[PDB]
Amino acid sequence: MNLTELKNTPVSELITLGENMGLENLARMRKQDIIFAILKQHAKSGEDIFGDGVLEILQDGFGFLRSADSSYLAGPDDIYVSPSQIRRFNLRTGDTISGKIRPPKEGERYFALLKVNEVNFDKPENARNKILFENLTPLHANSRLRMERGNGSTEDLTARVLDLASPIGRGQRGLIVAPPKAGKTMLLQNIAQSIAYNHPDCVLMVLLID
Amino acid sequence: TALQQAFDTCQNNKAAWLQRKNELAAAEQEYLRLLSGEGRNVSRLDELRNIIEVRKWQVNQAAGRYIRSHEAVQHISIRDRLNDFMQQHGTALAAALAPELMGYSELTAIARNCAIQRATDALREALLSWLAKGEKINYSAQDSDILTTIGFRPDVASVDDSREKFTPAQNMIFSRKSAQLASRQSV
Numbered sequence: 256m257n258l259t260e261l262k263n264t265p266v267s268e269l270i271t272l273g274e275n276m277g278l279e280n281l282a283r284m285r286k287q288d289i290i291f292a293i294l295k296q297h298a299k300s301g302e303d304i305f306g307d308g309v310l311e312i313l314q315d316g317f318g319f320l321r322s323a324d325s326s327y328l329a330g331p332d333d334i335y336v337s338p339s340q341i342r343r344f345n346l347r348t349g350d351t352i353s354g355k356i357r358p359p360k361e362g363e364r365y366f367a368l369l370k371v372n373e374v375n376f377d378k379p380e381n382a383r384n385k386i387l388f389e390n391l392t393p394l395h396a397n398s399r400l401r402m403e404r405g406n407g408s409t410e411d412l413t414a415r416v417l418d419l420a421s422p423i424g425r426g427q428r429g430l431i432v433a434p435p436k437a438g439k440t441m442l443l444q445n446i447a448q449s450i451a452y453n454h455p456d457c458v459l460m461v462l463l464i465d
Numbered sequence: 466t467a468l469q470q471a472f473d474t475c476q477n478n479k480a481a482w483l484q485r486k487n488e489l490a491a492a493e494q495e496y497l498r499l500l501s502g503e504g505r506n507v508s509r510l511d512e513l514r515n516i517i518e519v520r521k522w523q524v525n526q527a528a529g530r531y532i533r534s535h536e537a538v539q540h541i542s543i544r545d546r547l548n549d550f551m552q553q554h555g556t557a558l559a560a561a562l563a564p565e566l567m568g569y570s571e572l573t574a575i576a577r578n579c580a581i582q583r584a585t586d587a588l589r590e591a592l593l594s595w596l597a598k599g600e601k602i603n604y605s606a607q608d609s610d611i612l613t614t615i616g617f618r619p620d621v622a623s624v625d626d627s628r629e630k631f632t633p634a635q636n637m638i639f640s641r642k643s644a645q646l647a648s649r650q651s652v
Binding site for chain 1: 505506507508511512645
């Protein structure tokens with residue numbers, strides 16, 4: 256089983272598993288605790304359980320593994336990663352880690368990681384021989400990232416205005432001077448839609464603060 | 466062998482223009498195939514535009530220095546065979562144009578620069594009188610075979626690719642485009 260679809264699914268899965276597995280209750284507590292409880296009662300049978308997420312290292316090497324679905328809460332669903340795994344696989348912060356996870360015995364509370372089969376969407380040993388991002392020499396913008404979808408939608412006109420205003424390139428650095436009540440939400444929604452539609456090859460991540 | 470090596474260099478850069486013309490032809494054929502095809506991604510079209518533009522600038526400058534090399538190899542042979550002939554039988558036409566050269570030799574610089582246009586007009590009228598016949602003449606046997614390969618006039622492509630002229634800033638930016646394209650092709 257994988258925790259990705261368990262985190263994606265709504266409370267309907269919660270109630271169905273509550274009435275199937277016969278849990279004493281699942282209603283009045285945090286969703287992370289519910290996921291922990293259901294995964295514990297699923298793994299108590301001894302079946303193999305999978306895990307995926309993003310790994311990070313704290314000040315003492317106490318490796319944590321968070322999930323992008325939950326916006327990286329420090330909840331019980333985070334996967335423990337011992338410093339031995341880091342020192343044996345050279346996994347740094349932000350690495351995409353997928354592997355078999357270990358049920359916690361008495362003494363620890365977070366789930367550990369047994370094995371690994373995919374690091375950064377690649378073979379774990381292949382990721383050992385990688386070039387550092389800071390060591391890479393930067394360059395100018397070369398590949399144009401057009402805002403025009405070409406489908407002639409209502410906000411495709413706004414996209415065309417953005418095209419006529421400022422070209423966008425791969426590896427660029429954009430700053431928007433947006434006072435409040437600007438409608439900037441509409442423009443950023445159009446930008447995200449155009450990035451997803453015109454160029455599905457590039458991987459898109461969006462970050463929002465407060 | 467200066468004429469021979471000049472013609473060899475002319476052949477070299479002409480052939481170089483030929484291969485980059487073949488990469489051009491490849492560029493517009495793949496352009497047409499991808500434009501008539503399923504062009505969902507626009508970035509690929511973007512670099513298609515970039516390479517076709519830098520390639521057309523490259524063939525423009527190729528035609529430019531090919532015309533320059535053709536003119537140079539024409540004039541080097543012209544002056545070589547001309548001075549050979551003029552040293553071979555110069556006395557007759559020297560005596561035929563004796564007053565002008567005599568005034569050139571032993572008078573001041575102003576007369577030196579004033580005899581040249583008189584000689585120019587005399588040569589012009591002589592050539593105009595001769596060329597009214599319109600008889601065809603052949604190249605010098607020492608260089609006829611070489612010049613027939615290149616011809617008196619260059620290729621029609623070489624002259625219709627040279628209509629457009631770019632600003633020196635545009636020349637700099639397109640040379641930079643050529644350098645970055647070479648770097649891309651290296652990778």
